[PDB]
Design a protein around this motif. Sequence first.
Motif, PDB file in Angstrom:
ATOM      1  N   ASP A 155       0.837  -1.194   0.020  1.00  0.00           N
ATOM      2  CA  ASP A 155      -0.009   0.069  -0.006  1.00  0.00           C
ATOM      3  C   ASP A 155       0.756   1.263  -0.170  1.00  0.00           C
ATOM      4  N   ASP A 161      -0.187   4.207  -1.611  1.00  0.00           N
ATOM      5  CA  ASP A 161      -0.995   5.612  -1.260  1.00  0.00           C
ATOM      6  C   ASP A 161      -0.962   5.820  -0.024  1.00  0.00           C
ATOM      7  N   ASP A 184      -3.524   4.151   2.293  1.00  0.00           N
ATOM      8  CA  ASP A 184      -5.146   4.235   2.532  1.00  0.00           C
ATOM      9  C   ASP A 184      -5.789   2.779   3.268  1.00  0.00           C
ATOM     10  N   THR A 197      -5.624  -0.200   0.542  1.00  0.00           N
ATOM     11  CA  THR A 197      -5.828  -0.982  -0.561  1.00  0.00           C
ATOM     12  C   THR A 197      -4.483  -1.398  -1.291  1.00  0.00           C
ATOM     13  N   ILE A 198      -4.877  -2.212  -2.351  1.00  0.00           N
ATOM     14  CA  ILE A 198      -3.858  -2.390  -3.295  1.00  0.00           C
ATOM     15  C   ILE A 198      -4.204  -2.452  -5.000  1.00  0.00           C
ATOM     16  N   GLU A 226       0.244  -0.191  -7.457  1.00  0.00           N
ATOM     17  CA  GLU A 226       1.033  -0.892  -6.095  1.00  0.00           C
ATOM     18  C   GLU A 226       1.600  -2.239  -6.245  1.00  0.00           C
TER      19      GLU A 226
HETATM   20 CA   LIG Z   1      -3.563   1.544  -1.954  1.00  0.00          CA
END
Ligand SMILES: [Ca+2]
Length: 148
Positions: free
Chosen positions: A20, A22, A24, A26-27, A31
């Motif tokens: 992850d 970013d 947050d 999620t993937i 990513e």
């Molecule tokens: Ca992510």
Amino acid sequence: ADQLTEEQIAEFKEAFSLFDKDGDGTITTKELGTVMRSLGQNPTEAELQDMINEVDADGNGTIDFPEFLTMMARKMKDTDSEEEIREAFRVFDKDGNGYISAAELRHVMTNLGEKLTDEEVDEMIREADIDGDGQVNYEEFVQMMTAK
Ligand SMILES: [Ca+2]
Ligand SMILES: [Ca+2]
Ligand SMILES: [Ca+2]
Ligand SMILES: [Ca+2]
């Protein structure tokens, strides 16, 4: 997933914190594709999407903390291939100690059906040989195979 409380969650967390980017929870192809290519998979969009959807459970698209745990399980065998390569490493390693010297490998290459010289091989060693001791151990060999 009852045997995966804070105890496990913490462990898997790290494996889900690096992916992850970013930050947050999620993937996505961006990513997953950034780490997958790090090993030597270089999977195409269609590939990443298929892998993401396969794990995607919630029903959104991007892998989550819980869903991810699913992949880490299947992705554990996908890498198993490692061994499939070992066999090859052995062939090169004549003595069978661990490191593949220039001479050891040099001979092997010949069998293929060509005549190489210290020079030719030298150029190869400098390819896999990381440290620079004129040898190509397992680790050094693996990299070469997955090095374009
Ligand atoms: Ca992510
Ligand atoms: Ca998901
Ligand atoms: Ca050797
Ligand atoms: Ca070496």
